[PDB]
PDB file of C-alpha atoms and ligand atoms in Angstrom:
ATOM      1  CA  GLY J   2      90.055 -79.796 219.077  1.00 35.78           C
ATOM      2  CA  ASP J   3      87.050 -81.021 217.176  1.00 35.71           C
ATOM      3  CA  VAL J   4      84.775 -81.970 220.050  1.00 31.52           C
ATOM      4  CA  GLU J   5      82.263 -83.677 217.683  1.00 31.84           C
ATOM      5  CA  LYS J   6      84.958 -85.489 215.723  1.00 31.20           C
ATOM      6  CA  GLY J   7      86.226 -86.464 219.172  1.00 27.67           C
ATOM      7  CA  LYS J   8      82.831 -87.907 220.229  1.00 27.27           C
ATOM      8  CA  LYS J   9      82.727 -90.279 217.268  1.00 29.48           C
ATOM      9  CA  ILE J  10      86.207 -91.705 218.089  1.00 31.98           C
ATOM     10  CA  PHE J  11      84.989 -92.148 221.647  1.00 34.51           C
ATOM     11  CA  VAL J  12      81.777 -94.080 220.705  1.00 36.55           C
ATOM     12  CA  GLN J  13      83.786 -96.203 218.344  1.00 35.47           C
ATOM     13  CA  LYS J  14      86.830 -97.038 220.387  1.00 38.09           C
ATOM     14  CA  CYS J  15      86.255 -96.393 224.067  1.00 36.13           C
ATOM     15  CA  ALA J  16      82.500 -96.659 224.753  1.00 36.23           C
ATOM     16  CA  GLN J  17      82.780-100.464 225.029  1.00 33.14           C
ATOM     17  CA  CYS J  18      84.604-100.218 228.344  1.00 33.68           C
ATOM     18  CA  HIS J  19      84.017 -96.703 229.709  1.00 32.00           C
ATOM     19  CA  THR J  20      81.411 -94.139 230.783  1.00 31.82           C
ATOM     20  CA  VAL J  21      82.050 -90.393 230.935  1.00 34.59           C
ATOM     21  CA  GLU J  22      78.941 -89.089 232.713  1.00 35.07           C
ATOM     22  CA  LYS J  23      78.486 -88.100 236.349  1.00 33.86           C
ATOM     23  CA  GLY J  24      77.762 -91.075 238.539  1.00 32.32           C
ATOM     24  CA  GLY J  25      77.846 -93.280 235.363  1.00 31.10           C
ATOM     25  CA  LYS J  26      78.912 -96.914 235.918  1.00 31.75           C
ATOM     26  CA  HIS J  27      82.234 -98.695 235.807  1.00 32.65           C
ATOM     27  CA  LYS J  28      82.256-101.132 232.877  1.00 35.79           C
ATOM     28  CA  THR J  29      85.393-103.298 232.131  1.00 34.80           C
ATOM     29  CA  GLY J  30      87.189 -99.927 232.558  1.00 34.81           C
ATOM     30  CA  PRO J  31      86.284 -97.155 234.966  1.00 35.35           C
ATOM     31  CA  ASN J  32      83.843 -94.240 234.524  1.00 34.01           C
ATOM     32  CA  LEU J  33      85.784 -91.164 233.490  1.00 34.55           C
ATOM     33  CA  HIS J  34      83.888 -88.211 235.012  1.00 36.47           C
ATOM     34  CA  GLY J  35      86.478 -85.887 236.528  1.00 34.66           C
ATOM     35  CA  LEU J  36      89.654 -87.240 234.914  1.00 35.04           C
ATOM     36  CA  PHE J  37      91.452 -83.955 234.108  1.00 35.56           C
ATOM     37  CA  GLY J  38      93.522 -82.645 237.074  1.00 34.41           C
ATOM     38  CA  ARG J  39      93.311 -85.928 238.948  1.00 33.04           C
ATOM     39  CA  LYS J  40      96.055 -88.474 239.477  1.00 35.09           C
ATOM     40  CA  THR J  41      96.066 -91.937 237.998  1.00 40.58           C
ATOM     41  CA  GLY J  42      93.899 -94.697 239.437  1.00 43.16           C
ATOM     42  CA  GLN J  43      91.473 -92.398 241.285  1.00 40.20           C
ATOM     43  CA  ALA J  44      87.944 -93.321 240.203  1.00 37.06           C
ATOM     44  CA  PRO J  45      86.267 -94.260 243.497  1.00 36.79           C
ATOM     45  CA  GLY J  46      84.753 -97.721 243.329  1.00 39.31           C
ATOM     46  CA  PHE J  47      86.912 -99.204 240.557  1.00 38.55           C
ATOM     47  CA  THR J  48      89.730-101.667 241.380  1.00 37.14           C
ATOM     48  CA  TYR J  49      92.728-100.684 239.377  1.00 37.33           C
ATOM     49  CA  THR J  50      95.966-102.511 238.758  1.00 38.90           C
ATOM     50  CA  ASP J  51      98.758-101.295 241.126  1.00 39.45           C
ATOM     51  CA  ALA J  52     100.582-100.038 238.002  1.00 40.92           C
ATOM     52  CA  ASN J  53      97.703 -97.704 237.257  1.00 40.21           C
ATOM     53  CA  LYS J  54      97.303 -96.633 240.847  1.00 38.74           C
ATOM     54  CA  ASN J  55     101.034 -95.949 241.311  1.00 37.54           C
ATOM     55  CA  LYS J  56     101.844 -94.282 237.916  1.00 36.02           C
ATOM     56  CA  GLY J  57     101.645 -91.097 239.846  1.00 37.04           C
ATOM     57  CA  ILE J  58     101.201 -88.392 237.208  1.00 36.81           C
ATOM     58  CA  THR J  59      98.253 -85.914 236.759  1.00 34.53           C
ATOM     59  CA  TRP J  60      95.984 -86.314 233.769  1.00 35.89           C
ATOM     60  CA  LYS J  61      96.070 -83.320 231.408  1.00 37.44           C
ATOM     61  CA  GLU J  62      96.209 -83.025 227.576  1.00 36.29           C
ATOM     62  CA  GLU J  63      99.886 -83.822 227.565  1.00 33.53           C
ATOM     63  CA  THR J  64      99.888 -86.961 229.683  1.00 30.62           C
ATOM     64  CA  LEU J  65      96.773 -88.170 227.816  1.00 32.24           C
ATOM     65  CA  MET J  66      98.413 -87.474 224.446  1.00 33.81           C
ATOM     66  CA  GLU J  67     101.418 -89.805 225.208  1.00 32.29           C
ATOM     67  CA  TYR J  68      99.281 -92.464 226.930  1.00 31.22           C
ATOM     68  CA  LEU J  69      96.619 -92.789 224.255  1.00 30.75           C
ATOM     69  CA  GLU J  70      99.311 -93.440 221.702  1.00 34.17           C
ATOM     70  CA  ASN J  71     100.474 -96.577 223.503  1.00 35.35           C
ATOM     71  CA  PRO J  72      98.700 -97.321 226.791  1.00 32.36           C
ATOM     72  CA  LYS J  73     100.768-100.400 227.753  1.00 30.49           C
ATOM     73  CA  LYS J  74     103.977 -98.498 227.121  1.00 26.43           C
ATOM     74  CA  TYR J  75     102.944 -95.717 229.497  1.00 27.81           C
ATOM     75  CA  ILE J  76     101.319 -97.994 232.138  1.00 30.08           C
ATOM     76  CA  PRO J  77     103.214-101.277 232.116  1.00 34.66           C
ATOM     77  CA  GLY J  78     101.009-103.931 233.563  1.00 32.24           C
ATOM     78  CA  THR J  79      97.805-101.965 232.818  1.00 32.65           C
ATOM     79  CA  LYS J  80      94.748-104.166 232.346  1.00 34.02           C
ATOM     80  CA  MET J  81      93.425-101.764 229.644  1.00 35.16           C
ATOM     81  CA  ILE J  82      93.974-103.815 226.406  1.00 34.89           C
ATOM     82  CA  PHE J  83      93.715-101.292 223.600  1.00 34.17           C
ATOM     83  CA  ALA J  84      96.297-100.700 220.885  1.00 40.83           C
ATOM     84  CA  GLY J  85      96.242 -96.865 221.006  1.00 43.09           C
ATOM     85  CA  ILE J  86      95.473 -94.071 218.503  1.00 42.22           C
ATOM     86  CA  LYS J  87      98.323 -93.731 215.967  1.00 38.64           C
ATOM     87  CA  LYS J  88      97.459 -90.318 214.432  1.00 39.17           C
ATOM     88  CA  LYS J  89      98.067 -87.139 216.412  1.00 37.06           C
ATOM     89  CA  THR J  90      94.927 -85.303 215.271  1.00 36.81           C
ATOM     90  CA  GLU J  91      92.751 -88.213 216.313  1.00 35.44           C
ATOM     91  CA  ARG J  92      94.269 -88.097 219.794  1.00 38.00           C
ATOM     92  CA  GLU J  93      93.728 -84.318 219.808  1.00 38.29           C
ATOM     93  CA  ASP J  94      90.087 -84.609 218.783  1.00 36.01           C
ATOM     94  CA  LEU J  95      89.399 -87.268 221.447  1.00 36.00           C
ATOM     95  CA  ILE J  96      91.051 -85.136 224.222  1.00 36.88           C
ATOM     96  CA  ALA J  97      88.955 -82.092 223.298  1.00 38.50           C
ATOM     97  CA  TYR J  98      85.790 -84.285 223.520  1.00 36.66           C
ATOM     98  CA  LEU J  99      86.902 -85.811 226.843  1.00 37.14           C
ATOM     99  CA  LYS J 100      87.667 -82.442 228.520  1.00 38.81           C
ATOM    100  CA  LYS J 101      84.163 -81.364 227.592  1.00 37.24           C
ATOM    101  CA  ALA J 102      82.313 -84.528 228.556  1.00 37.53           C
ATOM    102  CA  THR J 103      84.339 -85.547 231.612  1.00 37.22           C
ATOM    103  CA  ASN J 104      83.894 -82.223 233.481  1.00 40.68           C
ATOM    104  CA  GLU J 105      80.210 -81.870 232.420  1.00 41.73           C
TER     105      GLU J 105
HETATM  106  C1  HEC H   1      88.314-102.301 227.221  1.00 37.34           C
HETATM  107  C2  HEC H   1      88.623-103.310 226.093  1.00 37.34           C
HETATM  108  C3  HEC H   1      88.938-100.894 227.137  1.00 37.34           C
HETATM  109  C4  HEC H   1      88.994-100.048 226.072  1.00 37.34           C
HETATM  110  C5  HEC H   1      88.552-100.377 224.621  1.00 37.34           C
HETATM  111  C6  HEC H   1      89.556 -98.808 226.499  1.00 37.34           C
HETATM  112  N1  HEC H   1      89.802 -98.869 227.865  1.00 37.34           N
HETATM  113 FE1  HEC H   1      90.480 -97.370 229.063  1.00 37.34          FE
HETATM  114  N2  HEC H   1      90.667 -98.641 230.572  1.00 37.34           N
HETATM  115  C7  HEC H   1      90.212 -99.931 230.608  1.00 37.34           C
HETATM  116  C8  HEC H   1      90.614-100.519 231.879  1.00 37.34           C
HETATM  117  C9  HEC H   1      90.258-101.976 232.271  1.00 37.34           C
HETATM  118  C10 HEC H   1      91.268 -99.621 232.567  1.00 37.34           C
HETATM  119  C11 HEC H   1      91.894 -99.763 233.989  1.00 37.34           C
HETATM  120  C12 HEC H   1      93.284-100.397 233.831  1.00 37.34           C
HETATM  121  C13 HEC H   1      94.050-100.700 235.082  1.00 37.34           C
HETATM  122  O1  HEC H   1      95.135-101.265 234.813  1.00 37.34           O
HETATM  123  O2  HEC H   1      93.644-100.384 236.201  1.00 37.34           O
HETATM  124  C14 HEC H   1      91.357 -98.407 231.780  1.00 37.34           C
HETATM  125  C15 HEC H   1      91.964 -97.231 232.209  1.00 37.34           C
HETATM  126  C16 HEC H   1      91.779 -96.045 231.536  1.00 37.34           C
HETATM  127  C17 HEC H   1      92.277 -94.714 231.877  1.00 37.34           C
HETATM  128  C18 HEC H   1      93.066 -94.449 233.201  1.00 37.34           C
HETATM  129  C19 HEC H   1      92.049 -93.815 234.239  1.00 37.34           C
HETATM  130  C20 HEC H   1      92.646 -93.397 235.546  1.00 37.34           C
HETATM  131  O3  HEC H   1      91.825 -93.361 236.526  1.00 37.34           O
HETATM  132  O4  HEC H   1      93.870 -93.118 235.582  1.00 37.34           O
HETATM  133  C21 HEC H   1      91.940 -93.870 230.955  1.00 37.34           C
HETATM  134  C22 HEC H   1      92.081 -92.335 230.642  1.00 37.34           C
HETATM  135  C23 HEC H   1      91.221 -94.612 229.936  1.00 37.34           C
HETATM  136  N3  HEC H   1      91.145 -95.955 230.325  1.00 37.34           N
HETATM  137  C24 HEC H   1      90.670 -94.058 228.827  1.00 37.34           C
HETATM  138  C25 HEC H   1      90.321 -94.722 227.677  1.00 37.34           C
HETATM  139  C26 HEC H   1      90.005 -94.134 226.420  1.00 37.34           C
HETATM  140  C27 HEC H   1      89.969 -92.596 226.128  1.00 37.34           C
HETATM  141  C28 HEC H   1      89.773 -95.120 225.552  1.00 37.34           C
HETATM  142  C29 HEC H   1      89.412 -95.046 224.066  1.00 37.34           C
HETATM  143  C30 HEC H   1      90.488 -94.712 223.031  1.00 37.34           C
HETATM  144  C31 HEC H   1      89.895 -96.399 226.275  1.00 37.34           C
HETATM  145  N4  HEC H   1      90.265 -96.107 227.595  1.00 37.34           N
HETATM  146  C32 HEC H   1      89.766 -97.667 225.741  1.00 37.34           C
HETATM  147  C33 HEC H   1      89.542-100.564 229.589  1.00 37.34           C
HETATM  148  C34 HEC H   1      89.403-100.125 228.286  1.00 37.34           C
END
């Protein structure tokens, strides 16, 4: 749960296509403010693939943990092209940063 170790991973691997702040813009991928507790494909204003819209699960540490390891495996047909984070601790660090930053 290293929130600052988490931030670095974020800058380095996700910042190219996402925003986490309130009212921040949609880049190639959607802004992430408010992820946690919300269903899949729910950022207002972003056009998601039907696969993402329809996944139908709630984002929490556990769904994020499985996803982030292999995004295309979890959301078949996703347009998010990213290989995933192999290491468990890296995924854990990034989730602790996201929980922090995505809820304010
Ligand atoms: C561009 C090359 C991307 C990188 C690098 C990362 N993401 Fe991404 N993400 C991107 C797109 C285009 C999409 C939408 C895909 C679709 O098929 O509609 C996504 C989606 C997400 C989601 C799902 C959000 C939801 O509303 O359910 C999440 C949590 C997400 N992206 C997070 C995320 C993180 C933490 C990343 C860094 C490891 C990351 N993405 C990389 C585009 C791109």
